[PDB]
Amino acid sequence: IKPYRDRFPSHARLPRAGLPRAEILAEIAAMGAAESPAWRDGYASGAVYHGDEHHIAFLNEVYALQSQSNPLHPDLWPSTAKFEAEVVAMTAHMLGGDAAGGTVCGTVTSGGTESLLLAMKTYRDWARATKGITAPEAVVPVSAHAAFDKAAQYFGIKLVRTPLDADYRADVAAMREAITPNTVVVAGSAPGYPHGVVDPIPEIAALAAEHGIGCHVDACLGGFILPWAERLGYPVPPFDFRLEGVTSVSADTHAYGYGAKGTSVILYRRPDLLHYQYFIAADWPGGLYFSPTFAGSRPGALSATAWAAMLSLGEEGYLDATRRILQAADRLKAGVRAIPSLKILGDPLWVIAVASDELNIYQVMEEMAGRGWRLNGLHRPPAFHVALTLRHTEPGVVDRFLADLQDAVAQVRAHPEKATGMAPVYGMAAAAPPELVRQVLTGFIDLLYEV
Ligand X SMILES: Cc1ncc(COP(=O)(O)O)c(C)c1O
Ligand Y SMILES: Cc1ncc(COP(=O)(O)O)c(/C=N/CCOP(=O)(O)O)c1O
Chain residues in the site for ligand Y (CB under 6 A): 46-47, 70, 72, 111-113, 145, 147, 189, 192-193, 218, 220-221, 252, 255, 264, 295-297
Q: Tell me if 198 sits within 8 A of 133, measured CB to CB.
A: no
Asked if residue 346 binds its own copies (CB under 8 A), the reply is no
CB of 236 to ligand Y, least distance (A): 16
Beta carbon nearer to ligand X, 97 or 257: 257
| Beta strands per DSSP E along 269-365 | 279-281, 289-291, 342-344, 351-356
Lay out the site mask for ligand X across 211-250 (x = CB under 6 A, - = otherwise).
-------x-xx-----------------------------
Q: Which residues pair with 183 in a beta bridge?
A: 137
Question: What is the closest distance, in whole angstroms, from the C-beta atom of residue 93 to its own copies in the complex?
Answer: 5
Phi then psi dihedrals of residue 255, to 5 deg = -90, -105
Which residue type, as a one-letter code, is found at position 306?
A: A
Return the residues of window 146-165 that contact ligand X according to CB under 6 A: 147
Whichever of 27 and 407 has its CB closer to its own copies, that residue is: 27
Q: Which residue is nearest to ligand Y (CB)?
A: 112
Using CB atoms, what's the residue nearest to ligand X?
112
Q: Mask 2-21, x = binds its own copies (CB under 8 A)?
A: xxx---x-xxxxxxxxxxxx
CA distance 171 to 199: 8
The entry of ligand X, ligand Y, its own copies, none near residue 121 (CB within 5 to 8 angstroms by kind) is its own copies
CB atoms inside a 10 Å sphere around CB 155:
16
Subset of 325-384 contacting ligand X (CB under 6 A):
none
Query: Which one among 129, 135, 156, 167 touches its own copies, defined by CB under 8 A?
Result: 156
* 386 lies in the site for ligand X, by CB under 6 A: no
Give the whole-angstrom CA distance, residue 370 versus residue 10: 29
Residue 28, SS3? helix
Question: Residue 198 Cβ, how far from ligand Y at the closest point, in Å?
Answer: 11
Residue 112 found at the interface with ligand X (CB under 6 A): yes
Residues 393-412 close enough to bind its own copies by CB under 8 A: none
The yes or no reply on residue 296 touching ligand X (CB under 6 A) is: yes
How far from the centroid of its chain's Cα atoms is residue 264's Cα?
10
Residues 300 and 79: their CA atoms lie apart, in Å, by: 9
The separation between the first and the last C-alpha atoms of the chain, rounded to the nearest angstrom, is 12
CA 292 to chain CA centroid, nearest Å? 21
User: Which ranges constitute the DSSP H helices of 160-214?
Assistant: 172-178, 201-210
C-alpha 45 chain-centroid distance? 12
Q: Binding residues for ligand X, how many (CB under 6 A)?
A: 13
Site for its own copies in 232-271 (CB under 8 A): 252, 254, 260-262, 271
Our finding on whether 297 is near ligand X (CB under 6 A) is: yes
* C-alpha 317 chain-centroid distance: 21
Residue partners of 6: CB distance under 8 A and separation at least 6: none
Q: Using an 8 Å Cβ cutoff, are 406 and 66 in contact?
A: no
Question: Closest approach of Cβ 76 to ligand Y, in Å?
Answer: 9
The answer to whether 221 contacts its own copies (rule: CB under 8 A) is no
Residue 141, strand partner residues: 162
Closer by beta carbon to ligand X, 296 or else 340: 296
Q: Which residues bind ligand X (CB under 6 A)?
A: 111-113, 145, 147, 193, 218, 220-221, 252, 295-297
